[model samples]
Target chain A: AMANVLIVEDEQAIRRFLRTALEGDGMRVFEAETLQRGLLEAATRKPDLIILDLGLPDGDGIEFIRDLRQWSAVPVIVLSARSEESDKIAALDAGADDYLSKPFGIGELQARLRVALRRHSTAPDPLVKFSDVTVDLAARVIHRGEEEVHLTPIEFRLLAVLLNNAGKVLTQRQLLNQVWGPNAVEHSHYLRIYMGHLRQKLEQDPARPRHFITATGIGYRFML
Target chain B: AMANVLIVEDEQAIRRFLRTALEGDGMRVFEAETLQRGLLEAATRKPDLIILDLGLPDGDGIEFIRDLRQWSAVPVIVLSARSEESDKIAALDAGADDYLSKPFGIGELQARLRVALRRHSAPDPLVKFSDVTVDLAARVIHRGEEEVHLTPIEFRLLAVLLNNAGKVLTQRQLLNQVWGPNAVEHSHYLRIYMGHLRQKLEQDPARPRHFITATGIGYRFML
Candidate 1:
């Protein structure tokens, strides 16, 4: 409730609106009108969160994120006008935690801010174990018995998704869209192939999987 | 050059528009008008990427994301009508990597698709030490001039130790990782495997140097 929030926005109206909204929520708010001043305030204030406007006049906001990441892991939420998706991708890849387009709902921004803050504060357990495999999420290493099992990026991502939602049934459409993209809700066979790969690597017997279980004609589930 | 893309939208007009744009880019495109069909196509086609519309008559798009996340890590870009922030947040939290509202420029969609595909195409890292180099991507290990072969168990043990190089890995930690949590109490399995690794990779199997034993505690891999 007493957290410090930094708002780096050039537009006075938007800055005031953010400040008022944050202050109303019992947060200590700091304002910076330019990227340079934002950086200075960020360094000195060490705020809990940063709300950055990507269209800053003084410097590129993505650069600010990259530079800030070199020194800190403070969460950043980017605000940008409706522009190219590349800009949003660039900001996110540069380490911005989340983003909001201009004229966004303040309530939604607050909800996203809460999500980011909650995530930053609560680090997930790094190690996950099921059957014979041990996955060190923090180290990005997976092992089964004495051999280190290697998973392709897609495979690993799939494993991560399953691991995160262990003991739950993920439908075929959900698995395809999540792994292949929304366009691939039809590539259900991809799941069978990759699930086969996972079973081959992780399960004691691929024919009778001990961990990655298919939900018949629906989807798949991970147990333990 | 052959990147298969799927588009899942109820609107035939939008699907047609997407197919033309993607086909013009020299990429194969598949389309599905409903969530059920989309899921079927994804499993069968195994496309490289996907474009999804959040609104469908059959089910909630967020539900689609949640279900898909159970098995696949294919990149998903969501298309939604400008509605509530909650929808965007739900899609993202459900594991959609990127989202675009309706009436978006095809150029922006293409750009985002390129970013997602490019990200997937990046190479995995390689781990090297001594005369042995491990290409994790290929799951192959090279020692000096020759490729070194390892059994599945041996390789997994080696990978775990090498990944946590320079740090002591307790027998329980090693056992849990290599053999499973159920085998954590069986410390002897650790010794047998460690001995096997020493015999295979160490300069002096009898007096090991790289794979150091911490007496009764655990094992550590130096350099």
Candidate 2:
């Protein structure tokens, strides 16, 4: 099956060129003319990969990547006319998976895409195990030294959701939405409270956790 | 210091021409008349780049590229007698970076040389995936918020894998690329370094996400 690709470029010619080239490579192409529209497309379509242009008229490409990374780890490959090495590094460091300068050969672009896709496929699944503690994914059960630790419904849901994505950071809104339903989207404190509960039961030291990682103001990541 | 360039062409006239041209440009030049010697020079001299003739009589050109790529990404530019597009693409896909047909102009050769050198001269970009970050330029790897240390060989091996992340790099390719062509037969180095990378990078070394092995072929760096 062909993976879906979202292309965000303001230039019509470049957008059309990328669409045709990616489609030729057996991918389903979704195009957006601006960063605003691209973000919407990304959330709604949940594309397998995203190709973004840095010189969009709508907003800064780095800002786009930074904002997108707050909610998702989906691969974002930036295309820019800037060939300076610093420019490439800046884009990459701003959460972009890869960067390709304009006038690049199609073969090189394809090669980069292959690398991005392969890396995306290897993300770690969340199922942290240490000593006798086991966080079972399917049942959302936290076992502590042979006995099943009872977690509040919200805590179980929080652990389950973070475990689902594992290494990727899930923003407060995303965690709240998944754990407490769409109605609780603005209730950020619910996340903090339940995360505390999970820490209390599952972590080796309740004050410090090795698995349920906090990303400060951003969100959380489950490292196994 | 300028890195040495190895030119492996059987023709005496072309060999002299390249040696003169490259030496004049301030590069250490190593010449090999046969594939056996070429492989030897590549192993012992350890040049930073290689220019190979595809029409060598003693060996298959594709085999040369494949053999060289199995261990190094030191930038291989193919100088071939055939002008066929398929040949160029095959050589490039096999591991050659740039392909120039025979009878190519010296101006074009020098320009291509600049392009090749410039492309690799810039420090390789560092990349991050999942929660871990890799600063290749600084030679530092971070897991979550903590810094993870690696050995010199571990760093070099990781550099090679990161450069070709996501492609199937055979054990031979990894060894030749990192350890040198002479060490291509030493598959143990590949296994050892790969283990080190996994131990240092992967959340669980037993089940690696970043460093994946392609059974019977090579290893692929996922990110």
Candidate 3:
């Protein structure tokens, strides 16, 4: 439950208040007097979130964000000076997740901080393989059962579409335009004929395909 | 040189030409015959650009776009069969990146396709991340390093909204202030204009990130 909180405010009174409040919550706290110091603390200390003060002297907070953004996406919650709505917006636009105008309650800031952290945390593969089959998308190769089975250019394109989609049921037109061309959509026979060709080559049982199966009157779906 | 292209269309013939031209350009292509399929393809294929036919059967094309835009920055090029400004505007306002009318030249479509792919891939626009800078007094807006031009009414709408930074209110309240009593009765334009402004200023207009709406009634400008 312990998270590092970096407070980049300058005023002695405010910084003291922040340290006590943050420490009171069973959290580790770090303080910086200016934007430059804050950046160092952020880089070196690696706090989960930064409590940035916009009114601090030295460099602009917005500049801090831009520079920080170049390297890290760590959440920054701005402690904006009251009445400086535009400044608050600038910090946010610079990628600050959330902000609080001064005269704010600690409870509210804590809530927003938790929200930012949770959101940041909230933010797989090219190769596809299934029972008795392995597909290499980049290399455009397919292997099934005991040995390798190669698909035609259009057939491989078709296989790639199904492999990429994996479990989704594709409509006839989707299969047609994707494998053949758009003009050949009505030619369902082409799909049936080509699909049969595929099953014969890759499926364990071509009569009843175990990997690629037809959706009766609908279309096709590739099962894992 | 093989850019991934996802075509979201249902019509047999329309889907045909786009596939031919796009694949002919040496781009890898994927297709979705329905809106849900389009959404899935978008999520799975991660196309460099999407060729969206607004005539997609069943679900509305606009719904596909705004939803696709939720976690995607993939460019969407809408192909509209009808020329009604309402149709095109609605598509654009819904977050379609560009538009092409039906029965149009394959050459021009390819040119537009190439441009969309180039813009999607190059990543030159400095306003890269989700941040917006609004200059109310000067009537200007900049997100990162990109200059976003806004129309007169659009600027006014944005200025009024930004003045409140993070406040939330219903559409009626905002429309009344931004457009006066005359607009309170007709709220249709509010959505369109808001969407246009959202497109102009908000990087991910769907998450909103800014210009956010709550279900049926609320609107918020989260600075």
Candidate 4:
């Protein structure tokens, strides 16, 4: 539970508050007030998780993520005051693993840290198992209790995308562009149709899904 | 060329040979006699490239590649003595970057090593660059005023490289995409098909200006 965490925020008060909160939880924490220092500390300290702020005195968190991603796949969680949806998406696209807006519950940050730390530890298994269902992503096969289930190319691709990003919320646009082509991102209906197909094939109760959870107007999350 | 390389072979003789070879080339080499040790060395050593032997006493190289790919994206080049199509395809599909036969010439291994290291170190663009106006999403490619009808394999091969414009895609990646997983073994298919693509799209198929090759590696679409 004592995961090493890095907080890259220029705000002194907020940094102190976060440091105190994490240290009390029996976790080791490192701090950097600027993007430059963040990168340096990251290279040296090699923290399991990074908490980044968008508005830094030196540079943007997005740039830090883009640069950090080149050499490392360490999980990055953006805990910035930039609550804009676009900001979160940009950070995520630039390689930040997850995002949390400021005025966030410390307990909430704790949960993201929990997930990120766990994610870095675990490998993305080709055979994903959930609720008496088994999906062989490598061989592209699915089964429910020794019964072989079939999925279309579209259905499997969508399922692969979801299973790959389980526990993380993927936006409708991201899901759409990944499953359907970029031309069909505007065609959100395509996602709805294919996602339904996935649930019907894999879910025990398609209506009451356990694994495939909807983010409600945002996108989707595959609950393990 | 001071890169770190891990050689995972069960044989002491071959291990010594490869170690001596790579070390002489200014590369730091690590050795593992089994798959388990290889995995351990890979995680701890963080090697830039791995040269694997398919048939190991503890486990097979295919399993090693699959397990390793779950965490690391380090390039793996299979240098097994197994001369079977199924063995080759399995290794590639399981995530080996490139496959080389054993008793291989040192010069040929150098070429492969170059591609492996080059790929381990290092993206995107448009449809239209010259006469080629590729509508990737729509699955259409045109040359000048003519709409060329490429085979399904040809189209996907084009689509994959075009999708990753300017990036070097290994022959294994192109093969998996074009011919489907558990597909062809020989890279000759990739070579001939790319030749066909150049014939249709390039101004000079003999001297391709668009479709490019990285010797012993793969292809790239320049636009």
Candidate 5:
């Protein structure tokens, strides 16, 4: 079945642009230019995913998300012109599945949409493996060959974020926002300290790493 | 205000054991028997933190975290008799912030929590390279006047490299420091994303001026 996507954007130009891109990707697309109409379509049409614009003409995007989350688990991806970390964090914490800052490439949007659908539909893989390590996503365990390793909550959040976006460069703000919340995006030292922990636990030699890599002045990526 | 924690363990002896230690450390404590109710209390009362056991009878503790991650980013520390690496990874990936294998020390858990909250509250400073400015405080990077947007891990990795500017951070040091402690092994992630950064920030990316590579070694961020 073609995935159904509903775009809740107030701007006609952006809505038309998005509709064309999603349609080109072989997916069904729906549009609403106002918050009221968007919510009505969302509740009644039951989209598989929602692309919401924060600058909606009717109400706050965050408020819309909080209201919709009361009964639905349908994934929501936020679009915003605001680049503030707080805005992204607020939306995500309020139940947004992903966020795309404005002027984002249509290709990037399409890729994120694919990721959301994959996460929502795929049968949970019990085991997610990367590098020389294997993580039992179901049992809550990590393995390297036969040896078991330990991880702190921060360390695990770091790992989980890496694994979930394997092969993609997750910027520091993104990781900090997801792993440590928006407030910690500036705590670069924390990333250093915790990444050191991941290395000590997962690397064959903590002095030399093979998996987790740095995108200096940008973010981190997980490699197989 | 000092933080409060809820411990969800089934065994009476173990429950008392953990309670005595945590309370002594100045934390308020709540307890739950089943995983289902543990989640409910966490959602409703919203304690500052939670310590969960993976062996609860009602359901898999891993599921509890995945579900929690869907709505909340509260800190969760996991305890389990299953001392398997797979279990730890699953719990971590599923969204438990940290995991403690069975027969662990209370001191370690408490210490880790201290680090967690401390790191959570620490201020992030702004960093600069050439004419480009990275406002870590604001989570904004500007190439002159043009603003640049980076993914979460990108910002963290960049901040770390810049923090150690002028220092040749080896692959291990770079990966460990940027990706958090568990990700020191995925070094290839470094090469690919560095390419992304260069494409975004460097004047002539083909010959990067600021983000330099110490080939066969690691990477460094120079002014």
Candidate 6:
């Protein structure tokens, strides 16, 4: 596919270099010198991939990523100076797809660009597994070892949310909003009840769960 | 929140150094010396994030990352002695979240760890159509100036329908989604719930506009 790429770099030399390299690959390239212009271009052009410089003049690249993630899943690859490791981490945590240090070779940049673009093109897998549980997203089926574990609609929704976001700690508000809809965000008891159900059905030891973990006052996290 | 970190490196000294640094940050740490052990630990311990060494004797770190990615979205940060640009690209392309060269500072490693953990903790999005807004992030629904209330079952049914809007949801599909697989055969429940939803959201319940029925087939939401 002839994918579109957006490069947000303050340095004209790097921007020109990136444009030449990207255009050479037969891809359309959009350029932005600042975060504001980058965000504007992203909103309008809707590039398939974004190459952002962390040290932009107008604002922090982290803020741009955070704002962009609020509405879009566009893949973002960060470019930073060698010493700005913390900034690279911040950008990634803020939803950047990858990073490149300054003075990176065109080959490396092109390879990373391919990786990011390839990832975005594929739909998320419908089947996921950990331990004994096999969740079939398309069929809405869950199996624990040999038995078909039956989940109530609410319970299944909760499991789906946790499984979809495995390894992430989901807040009580986030979970409620997703599984029970937005109005039930305040109903922490609903989470308690359904989480209890999920644990009872899925976890090997409900008393000491391995999968459905509690995050105390925050919410819960699904591990494997 | 307190996080668990798994370090999969073969060298004892580096593992010790990482363990000390991560423990100093108040995280529970787990270690594995081989790719096989690392995979086992990852499957069993379920650490929040993984710090993997790319040069283990037992297996390829790239292969480890690809295999883990098949079923898990656990964030992986690759630590490699080889600083070659191709190596970094390979690890990242294999689904590793970040790549760190050897001789890296503890501070930077900690920062990267925090970044991976923080990124995965964000919430889902919102769904909207016409004047009715469904804030899936807050579990709230609004029609213009007014708030619309729905029971747990009604809300779940609405979510399934709205999520698959424009596509015809067969009676079996609707029944299974809203009432679980056991009730897929109980198609009558779909009628009662659809009637309730139409009454609540539609401008006119008698002649529904948004919630359309397909007579013998199923249901579909217009907006």
Task: Please name the candidate that would achieve the greatest lDDT relative to the true structure.
Answer: 6
Residue-level lDDT of model 1, residues B1-223, one tens digit each, is 6889989999988988899999997889999998868866876687789889987877778756654553346788899886667887777777777777888878767766875675555454566666777764355778887988887677778877876775567789888766666898999888998889888787788998788776555787867
The CA lDDT of each predicted structure is 0.79, 0.75, 0.71, 0.76, 0.75, 0.80
Higher-DockQ candidate of 1 and 3: 1
Over A107-163, each residue of candidate 4 has an lDDT whose tens digit, in order, gives 545544664565445233357889888887644557789886767667877888988
- Name the runs in model 4 displaced over 4 angstroms: A1-224, B122-223
Error of 3 at A77 (Å): 39
Model 3 misplaced stretches (Cα beyond 4 Å): A1-224, B122-223
Clashing pairs in 3: A93-B131, A182-B16
lDDT tens digits, residue span B42-96, model 3: 7667678898888876767876776565345677888988965566557766667
* TM-scores of all candidate predictions against the true structure: 0.43, 0.38, 0.31, 0.31, 0.31, 0.49
TM-score of chain B of each: 0.55, 0.57, 0.56, 0.54, 0.53, 0.55
lDDT computed for candidate 5: 0.75
Candidate 6 regions with alpha-carbon error over 4 angstroms: A1-3, A21-27, A54-75, A82-98, A114-224, B122-223
Candidate 1 Cα errors over 4 Å, as ranges: A1-7, A10-13, A16-33, A37-51, A59-77, A81-99, A110-224, B1-3, B119-223
For model 4, residues B100-128, the per-residue Cα lDDT tens digits are 66776676566557645753451212378
DockQ leader: 6
Query: For candidate 3, what is the TM-score?
Result: 0.31
| lDDT score of residue A24 within candidate 6 | 71
What would the per-residue lDDT of candidate 6 be over residues A1-224, giving only the tens digit for each residue? 68999999989888888888788777888888889899999999999999998867787788899999998888888888766667666666778867777778887787778766764563333668888888876545578898767666678778888988989999999998998898888988877877888889888789999988999889899987
Better of 1 and 6 by DockQ: 6
- Report RMSD (Å) for each prediction in the order shown: 18.5, 17.3, 23.9, 22.7, 24.7, 22.4
Stretches off by above 4 angstroms in model 5 are A122-224, B1-223
* True lDDT of residue B18, candidate 6: 92
